[PDB]
Amino acid sequence: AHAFWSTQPVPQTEDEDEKIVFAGPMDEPKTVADIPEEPYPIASTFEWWTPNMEAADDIHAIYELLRDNYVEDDDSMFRFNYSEEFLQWALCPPNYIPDWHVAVRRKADKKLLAFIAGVPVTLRMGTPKYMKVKAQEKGEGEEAAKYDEPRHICEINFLCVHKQLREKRLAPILIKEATRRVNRTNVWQAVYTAGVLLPTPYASGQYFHRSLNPEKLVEIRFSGIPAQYQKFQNPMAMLKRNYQLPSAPKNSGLREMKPSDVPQVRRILMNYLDSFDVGPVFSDAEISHYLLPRDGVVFTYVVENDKKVTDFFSFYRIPSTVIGNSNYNLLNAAYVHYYAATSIPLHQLILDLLIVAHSRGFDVCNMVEILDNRSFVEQLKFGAGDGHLRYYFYNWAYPKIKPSQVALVML
Ligand SMILES: CCCCCCCCCCCCCC(=O)SCCNC(=O)CCNC(=O)[C@H](O)C(C)(C)COP(=O)(O)OP(=O)(O)OC[C@H]1O[C@@H](n2cnc3c(N)ncnc32)[C@H](O)[C@@H]1OP(=O)(O)O
Ligand SMILES: Cc1nn(C)c(C)c1NS(=O)(=O)c1c(Cl)cc(-c2ccnc(N3CCNCC3)c2)cc1Cl
């Protein structure tokens, strides 16, 4: 049973998801005037707080909460340690709404207890291709096309309750208050991902990992030496050999992205993401924000030969705290972000991603099997992990799609 999720406008079961044939809202159309202006009620010893995600101290406060209380693996070996610079980048994109950054603090001494954050996204979330075909076959083209235009909605992330406050039904209250603040802004859908299975994803993909520093990954037990390698005299030497990379990129004309690259990168990215059922639409301002290099946060390279940009890739950094190991404090992970290839095969473009990430001291390259990420898995020696990222909408009925039909990278 789901005492909270059963009350919310999301599909309730997989069986229900199979009956969905058109994109559209779940709930009753409602107005901003219908939405309470007073904050959701909360216990008298707590209070709502809106941190300023551009202000160093407030960013540091939220950073500490997440550092100590955000996503861990099941064996409490690793915990995400999103940096302060990362949080300001993720949470303050163009036209962000400060009121969508929602915290709870203990009233007496202002102890920070919980967080949830929304950001705007312009999303294509109309009926997927395979379902539009079914609609044509049945003379239902019109209903299937009703919500084809890209929508201005909310992306939700960084939901976090302090370890001491777990299993007290605080997460639902955060979710209700975030919903209220978003609805007051006349937005009625959200998109979110989680590693856990909730009612009810519209897509799911496995995580994949590419070892860059296998000796450290084995040391911290992110990886082990696979059985097959025990037939060698030095299993770790062979493992290191297996994962060795060039020390400099191989593509002629690879360089870091510059502000002047924004229009070309926008063009080639938007052309590419069009091929997917669910994907973001990005303005120039949003391309600049999400793709221009930021030290320690996001790294973006373009292939420019003979004064023209033909390809690009981007990756972002999230270190994870290594909880139990004494010798290392962090696992430095690079995550595959947006990319587009027009001049070279995708594997040739992404090999340079691995090369750059390795040169910069990253330990592993991670991604979900979205976009065309499957197309380079084997050649570049990615392996599936035990994790899955599930993709959800709030208040949006959506036919189940494959993860290779998802083009929205979730941070
Ligand atoms: C229109 C605008 C709409 C805006 C809102 C869109 C919706 C956004 C929804 C949020 C998208 C977040 C995207 C991300 O950030 S995913 C990252 C989530 N964060 C973590 O995993 C950090 C570590 N864990 C925690 O901080 C806590 O365990 C959390 C906060 C996750 C739950 O705290 P706690 O463990 O103390 O439990 P509770 O007693 O307060 O509450 C129990 C209820 O919460 C349901 N639950 C558990 N985990 C999740 C989860 N990841 N998404 C949604 N719901 C979740 C659970 O099924 C149960 O409901 P029900 O099964 O009884 O029905
Ligand atoms: C290195 C490491 N550090 N940590 C903390 C872990 C769990 C690992 N192991 S992992 O790499 O193999 C991996 C990774 Cl990265 C991520 C998740 C996961 C779980 C829940 N949710 C998300 N969302 C990402 C998008 N925003 C919303 C939440 C990701 C699961 C695994 Cl299992």
Residues 6+ apart with CB under 8 A from 254: 301, 302, 303, 352
Alpha-carbon gap, residue 360 to 333, rounded angstroms? 11
Mutation choice for ligand 1 from 8, 69, 159, 173, CB with most ligand atoms inside 8 A? 159
Alpha-carbon gap, residue 35 to 41, rounded angstroms? 14
Long-range Cβ contact pairs of 290-293 (< 8 A, separation 24 or more): 290/93, 290/314, 290/337, 290/338, 291/257, 291/262, 291/265, 291/337, 291/338, 292/257, 292/258, 292/259, 292/262, 293/256, 293/257
Q: Are strands 190-194 and 151-161 parallel, antiparallel or unpaired?
A: parallel
8-state DSSP, 372:
T
Mutation choice for ligand 2 from 67, 80, 159, CB with most ligand atoms inside 8 A? 80
Alpha-carbon gap, residue 218 to 108, rounded angstroms? 45
Alpha-carbon gap, residue 245 to 411, rounded angstroms? 26
Cβ–Cβ < 8 Å for 375, 347: yes
8-state DSSP, 30:
-
Alpha-carbon gap, residue 87 to 67, rounded angstroms? 11
Cβ–Cβ < 8 Å for 339, 347: no
Alpha-carbon gap, residue 262 to 287, rounded angstroms? 6
Alpha-carbon gap, residue 87 to 52, rounded angstroms? 11
Q: Is 154 helix (H, G, I), strand (E, B) or coil?
A: strand
CB neighbours (10 Å) of residue 392? 21
Please tell me if the CB atom of residue 10 comes closer than 6 angstroms to any atom of ligand 1. no
Alpha-carbon gap, residue 92 to 73, rounded angstroms? 27
At how many Å resolution was this determined? 1.6
8-state DSSP, 8:
S
Q: DSSP secondary structure string, 68-122? A: HHS-B-TTSSEEE---HHHHHHHH--TT--GGGEEEEEETTT--EEEEEEEEEEE
Cβ–Cβ < 8 Å for 195, 389: yes
Ligand 2: residue whose CA is nearest its atom 30? 387
Ligand 2: residue whose CA is nearest its atom 9? 73
Compute, in angstroms, the gap from residue 28 CA to the centroid of ligand 2. 34
Q: Which ligand is nearest to the CA of 197?
A: 1
Neighbouring-strand partners of residue 208:
367, 384
Return the H-helix or E-strand segment holding 339. Answer: strand 330-341
Cβ–Cβ < 8 Å for 128, 278: yes
CA angle 327, 329, 333 (to 5 degrees): 120
Residues tagged in the binding site annotation for Mg(2+): 165
Cβ–Cβ < 8 Å for 105, 113: yes
The tokens describing 71, both together, are: 């996503």
Q: Which ligand is nearest to the CA of 389?
A: 2
Query: What is the domain extent for residue 22?
Result: 1-411
Q: Which of 360, 394, 391, 381 is nearest to 154 (CA)?
A: 394
Alpha-carbon gap, residue 243 to 229, rounded angstroms? 13
Strands (DSSP E) found in 263-307: 279-280, 298-305
Alpha-carbon gap, residue 117 to 296, rounded angstroms? 22
Q: DSSP secondary structure string, 197-255? A: --S--SEEEEEEEEESSHHHHHHTTSS---GGGGGSS-HHHHHHHHH---SS--STTEE
The tokens describing 386, both together, are: 């035990």
Q: Are strands 298-305 and 254-256 parallel, antiparallel or unpaired?
A: antiparallel
CATH of the domain at 369: 3.40.630.170
The tokens describing 341, both together, are: 């290839």
Cβ–Cβ < 8 Å for 193, 351: no
Neighbouring-strand partners of residue 151:
123
8-state DSSP, 289:
H
Neighbouring-strand partners of residue 120:
154
Cα atoms in the 13 Å half-sphere on the side-chain side of 245: 30
Alpha-carbon gap, residue 321 to 72, rounded angstroms? 9
Cα atoms in the 13 Å half-sphere on the side-chain side of 86: 22
Q: Which ligand is nearest to the CA of 113?
A: 1
The tokens describing 287, both together, are: 């391309």
Compute, in angstroms, the gap from residue 350 CA to the centroid of ligand 1. 34
CA angle 76, 78, 84 (to 5 degrees): 130
Ligand 2: residue whose CA is nearest its atom 28? 194
165 φ/ψ sector (left φ>0, alpha ψ -120 to 50, else beta): alpha
Residues tagged in the binding site annotation: 2-5, 159, 161, 165-167, 169-171, 193
Number of domains in the chain: 1
Q: How deeply is 324 buried, as exposed, middle or buried, from its count of CB atoms within 10 A (0-12, 13-18, 19+)?
A: exposed
The CA distances from residue 52 to 70, 289, 309, in Å, are 20, 18, 37
The tokens describing 19, both together, are: 């009956």
CB neighbours (10 Å) of residue 410? 16
Q: Is position 292 annotated as part of the catalytic site?
A: no
Q: Does 179 sit behind a cis peptide bond, omega within 30 degrees of 0 on the bond before it? A: no
Cβ–Cβ < 8 Å for 257, 301: yes
Alpha-carbon gap, residue 88 to 335, rounded angstroms? 18
Q: Is 350 helix (H, G, I), strand (E, B) or coil?
A: helix
